Amino acid sequence: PVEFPKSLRASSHSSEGGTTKEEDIYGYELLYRSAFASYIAPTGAWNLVWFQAADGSIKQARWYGEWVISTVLAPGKALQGTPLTALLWGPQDTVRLYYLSPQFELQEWCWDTKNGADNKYDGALNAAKVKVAPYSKLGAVSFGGANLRVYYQGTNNKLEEYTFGGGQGWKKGATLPGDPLPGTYISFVNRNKWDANPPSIRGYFQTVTGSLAEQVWETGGWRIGQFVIPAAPFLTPISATVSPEKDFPKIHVYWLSVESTIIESVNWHGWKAPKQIDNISVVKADISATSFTRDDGTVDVRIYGTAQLNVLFERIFRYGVWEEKIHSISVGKEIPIEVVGVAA
Amino acid sequence: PVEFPKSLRASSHSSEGGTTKEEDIYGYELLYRSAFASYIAPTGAWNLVWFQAADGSIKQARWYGEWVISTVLAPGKALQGTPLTALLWGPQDTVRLYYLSPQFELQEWCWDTKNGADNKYDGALNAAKVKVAPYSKLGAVSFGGANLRVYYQGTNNKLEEYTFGGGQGWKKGATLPGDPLPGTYISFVNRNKWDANPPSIRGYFQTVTGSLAEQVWETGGWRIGQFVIPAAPFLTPISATVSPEKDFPKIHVYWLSVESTIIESVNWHGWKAPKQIDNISVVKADISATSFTRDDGTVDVRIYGTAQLNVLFERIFRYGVWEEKIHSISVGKEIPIEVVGVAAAL
Ligand SMILES: OC[C@H]1O[C@@H](O)[C@@H](O)[C@@H](O)[C@@H]1O
Ligand SMILES: OC[C@H]1O[C@@H](O)[C@@H](O)[C@@H](O)[C@@H]1O
Ligand SMILES: OC[C@H]1O[C@@H](O)[C@@H](O)[C@@H](O)[C@@H]1O
Ligand SMILES: OC[C@H]1O[C@H](O)[C@@H](O)[C@@H](O)[C@@H]1O
């Protein structure tokens, strides 16, 4: 078998006190510790998840009644270990996926379905040849329709913005405040609706001290916000999502605990205390959260990431509860392996 | 600060029972979880370590009284996250480093220094265009001088061999026995001297069951050996090294425990029970062991790898003891970060 810390739970079928003996899955055609991006339709009708296969291609898992896997970027196009982040607007007929080339330049993939078209193509951002820190992660928001903002870590470790819209093409945007940890995970959200202008932007990142911090764009420029987590694991995955609840933006910020369990902080008329959503240890690797507002007014959340041993999980918050059923989305060949909990 | 499990020690200066509050170093120009290859000279005089920088270049740390860092392969030559493995013979003037291209093909870097030469150049393996499983690790041995063997994981997850020597050029070699875990770490050693022929080859890997297993080559062919570890962490780093102690090959096999401490098992007139070499948790990432035999017949070991938070460590076994001082080798810009031991999620 493989050994796992006895005090930690490897799956939803682990013993209550930790792992004793169980079977878990290794999906070996998923890049180990793959990046993830995601977007659920604002109606909840379908879901998009993007990930990196073992061969370095970028693939898509689309849920529409069932999950269907496809390839969106051929092998050779993306850095092995690229970050990923996605945009969806129109309300839901225009998709952009951002990633890094093997030369650490911002790249863009475009998928347009307006009027029943199906165009998939390289975006104009590639022309700017924006070289980023090689360990940079990526975030992005959209507003007013096709006004786009891409966030990354520049070569001096500051967070940086690139902008698109208003007929200007891609241009360098703001340099953001704060002192970001080199290689920090980053996640940016727009608290206002996709077609509204101005946006209300928040970004989440880890600082050089290990704390988690918040970027705010609200009225007159970028500032550091009130969200402060004094201590978090080194290079902890971070992903945030926002959707309105009772006509007010509900931000969910997720990161990993020292046990690699998922911690959630909610902003909705103030920040609520961080809370562990479940006690199952995921692989310490990128996660991706998305959300929508049901027609009954409640906010659903989905989180994607890597579960033991190497599988794409889906965690579901629906009707006010995290479902005990944690799904797994197969992306290729798999082997089952026995796992035993071992003490120090 | 950053949070670290309170029950684990992050460094030599951690409290006796785990981490309380301390400062540790983030070397952010070392690729996080870099691969490592290494070779100490058979005389013990100097050391070579290879690693991947954050920008994807392959760099070299050379010790000869002091550590000196140089760049051997520019960005673009190697896959981001490439495995690495090295050969040294001549007895000690001919170096090879194996890595993967960004298209998952075997590549070879050569460094020849015989007769005072100083030549770095691409090897002929590149032209063979050998596609491997994208998560393949790499091992290699040399014998009879320049008879070379490169070990990798093929697309069907079997371990595979490529051969060089006898004027034949690079050719496909054996398919090895056993059922390897996809992406397993691998480490191959030659128990016989660099100029001897035949070799006595051992390889260490993780199987589909999670156990650790051993490849054996002797005259007659390949077989699965008697070294068996029934359970190990999933995708545990593995590195082995061999050198003669009192004229008999002493194999040291290293892997990580669930606490990410280094476990050692020695073969020398039989296998000895696995034993933790120290209780400091390294980053769960590639390690690299090397060894040499002193004039008195005793065997020194060096282990390289990633220590918290992201630093290149050197652990030293010298004159029969692991030295308490665990060294760090700076490879670029660094920031110190406070680390606090935490017992629960919140
Ligand atoms: O129509 C294609 C264009 O769409 C815009 O929204 C941006 O994504 C451009 O970079 C892209 O070239
Ligand atoms: O002389 C150069 C040659 O050296 C041999 O040992 C091998 O490494 C070859 O691949 C290389 O081309
Ligand atoms: O002769 C075969 C045996 O040789 C010894 O050196 C060890 O490596 C054993 O594990 C192996 O099975
Ligand atoms: O207006 C800025 C303010 O907006 C929201 O309330 C949250 O994102 C806060 O953390 C932030 O300080």
Judge whether A315 and A31 are in contact, CB under 8 Å.
Answer: no
Pairing between β-strand A334-342 and β-strand A2-5 as defined by DSSP bridges: parallel
Token pair belonging to B198: 């035949």
CA dist., res. B204 & res. B254, Å (int): 10
What is the Cα Rg of chain B in Å?
19
> Would the CB atoms of B234 and A103 count as touching at under 8 Å?
no
What is the side-by-side strand order in the sheet with A275-276? A238-245, A248-256, A262-267, A275-276
Vertex A85: Cα angle to A235 and B78 (nearest 5): 65
- The highest-level CATH class for domain B2-342 is mainly beta
CB atoms within 10 A of CB B269: 11
> Would the CB atoms of A259 and B79 count as touching at under 8 Å?
no
Judge whether B188 and B149 are in contact, CB under 8 Å.
Answer: yes
Judge whether B181 and B205 are in contact, CB under 8 Å.
Answer: yes
Instruction: Count Cβ neighbours within 10 Å for each residue of A65-88 and write b for 16 or more, e otherwise.
Output: eebebeebbebebbbbbbbbbbbb
Question: Which of B 212-271 lie inside 8 A of A, CB atoms?
Answer: 230-235, 257-259
Measured in angstroms, how far is the CA atom of residue B221 from the centroid of ligand 3? 13
Q: Which of A202, A245, A265 to mutate to test the pocket of ligand 4 (most atoms within 8 A of CB)?
A: A202
> Would the CB atoms of A182 and B335 count as touching at under 8 Å?
yes
Distance in Å, alpha carbon of B243 to nearest chain A alpha carbon = 30
> Would the CB atoms of B258 and A76 count as touching at under 8 Å?
no
Q: Which of B85, B94, B109, B110 to mutate to test the pocket of ligand 2 (most atoms within 8 A of CB)?
A: B110
CA dihedral angle for residue B4, residue B6, residue B11, residue B14, rounded to 10 degrees: 140
| A70: nearest Cα among A332, A342, A343 | A332
Token pair belonging to B207: 């199987």
SS3 state at B81? coil
Q: In chain A, whose CA is at the least distance from the CA of B30?
A: A135
Q: Which of B80, B133, B338 sits opposite A79 (nearest CB)?
A: B80
Pairing between β-strand A321-322 and β-strand B288-293 as defined by DSSP bridges: unpaired
Question: Which of B 266-295 lie inside 8 A of A, CB atoms?
Answer: none
Distances (CA, A) of A13 to A2, A4, B297: 16, 14, 53
Distance in Å, alpha carbon of A148 to nearest chain B alpha carbon = 28
Which region holds residue A19: left if phi is over 0, alpha if psi is between -120 and 50, else beta? beta
For A98, residues 6+ apart whose C-beta sits below 8 A from its C-beta are: A84, A85, A86, A87, A106, A107, A108, A109, A125, A138, A140, A150
For A168, residues 6+ apart whose C-beta sits below 8 A from its C-beta are: none
Q: Which of B192, B202, B204 to mutate to test the pocket of ligand 3 (most atoms within 8 A of CB)?
A: B202
Q: Which of B32, B208, B344 sits opposite A335 (nearest CB)?
A: B208
Contacts for B191-194: CB closer than 8 Å, 24+ residues apart:
B191/B242, B191/B249, B191/B251, B192/B143, B192/B249, B194/B42, B194/B88, B194/B89, B194/B90, B194/B91, B194/B142, B194/B143, B194/B145
CB of A164 within 6 A of ligand 1: the answer is yes
Judge whether A33 and B241 are in contact, CB under 8 Å.
Answer: no
Judge whether A5 and A11 are in contact, CB under 8 Å.
Answer: no
Pairing between β-strand B221-224 and β-strand A222-224 as defined by DSSP bridges: unpaired
Mutate to test the interface with A, among B19, B28, B258, B335 (most CBs of A within 10 A): B258
> Would the CB atoms of A231 and B258 count as touching at under 8 Å?
no
CA dist., res. B198 & res. B181, Å (int): 29
Provide, as residue numbers in chain B, all residues whose Cβ is less than 8 Å from the Cβ of A335: 182, 208
> Would the CB atoms of A342 and B2 count as touching at under 8 Å?
no
Distance in Å, alpha carbon of A115 to nearest chain B alpha carbon = 38
> Would the CB atoms of A5 and B103 count as touching at under 8 Å?
no
Measured in angstroms, how far is the CA atom of residue B34 from the centroid of ligand 2? 26
CA dist., res. A142 & res. A196, Å (int): 10
Measured in angstroms, how far is the CA atom of residue B200 from the centroid of ligand 3? 10
Distance in Å, alpha carbon of A139 to nearest chain B alpha carbon = 20
SS3 state at B126? helix
Residue nearest to atom 3 of ligand 1 (CA): A123
Token pair belonging to B56: 């994807």
Q: What CATH fold (topology level) applies to the domain A2-341?
A: Neuraminidase (2.120.10)
CA dist., res. B277 & res. B274, Å (int): 9
Token pair belonging to B136: 């393949």
CB atoms within 10 A of CB B172: 11
Token pair belonging to B215: 């490849």
Q: Which of B187, B200, B216 to mutate to test the pocket of ligand 3 (most atoms within 8 A of CB)?
A: B216
SS3 state at A257? coil
Contacts for B110-119: CB closer than 8 Å, 24+ residues apart:
B111/B72, B114/B90
Terminal alpha carbon distance of chain B: 15
DSSP letters along A176-241, please?
Answer: P-S-BPTT--EEEEESS-TT-SS--EEEEEEBTTS-EEEEEESSSSEEE-S--BS-EETT--EEEE
CA dist., res. B62 & res. B39, Å (int): 10
Judge whether B19 and B6 are in contact, CB under 8 Å.
Answer: yes
| B281: nearest Cα among B257, B251, B317, B310 | B257
Judge whether A111 and A119 are in contact, CB under 8 Å.
Answer: yes
Judge whether B299 and B48 are in contact, CB under 8 Å.
Answer: no
| A282: nearest Cα among A82, A85, A45, A34 | A34
Distance in Å, alpha carbon of B237 to nearest chain A alpha carbon = 13
Which region holds residue A100: left if phi is over 0, alpha if psi is between -120 and 50, else beta? beta
Instruction: Count Cβ neighbours within 10 Å for each residue of B76-94 and write b for 16 or more, e otherwise.
Output: ebbbbbbbbbbbbbbebeb
Provide, as residue numbers in chain B, all residues whose Cβ is less than 8 Å from the Cβ of A232: 2-3
Token pair belonging to A273: 């205390």
SS3 state at B114? helix
CA dist., res. A15 & res. B140, Å (int): 42
Token pair belonging to B192: 């016989």
CA dist., res. B169 & res. B161, Å (int): 14
| A57: nearest Cα among A102, A17, A20, A14 | A102
Q: CB of B156 within 8 Å of any CB in chain A? A: no
For A94, residues 6+ apart whose C-beta sits below 8 A from its C-beta are: A87, A88, A111, A112, A113, A114, A146
User: At B75, which amino acid appears?
Assistant: P
> Would the CB atoms of A80 and B76 count as touching at under 8 Å?
no
Judge whether A216 and A191 are in contact, CB under 8 Å.
Answer: no
CA dist., res. B323 & res. A269, Å (int): 56
Question: Which of A 73-112 lie inside 8 A of B, CB atoms?
Answer: 75-76, 79-81, 102-104
> Mind spelling out the 3-state secondary structure of A22-50?
EEEEEECCECCCCCEEEEECCCCCCEEEE
Vertex A204: Cα angle to A153 and A265 (nearest 5): 160
Provide, as residue numbers in chain B, all residues whose Cβ is less than 8 Å from the Cβ of A137: none
DSSP letters along A95-139, please?
Answer: EEEEEE-TTSBEEEEEEE-GGG--EEEE-GGGGG--B--TT--EE
Judge whether B18 and B343 are in contact, CB under 8 Å.
Answer: no
Q: Where are the domains of chain A?
A: 2-341
CA dist., res. B285 & res. B282, Å (int): 8
Q: Is A161 exposed, middle or buried (0-12, 13-18, 19+ CB in 10 A)?
A: buried
Which region holds residue B76: left if phi is over 0, alpha if psi is between -120 and 50, else beta? left
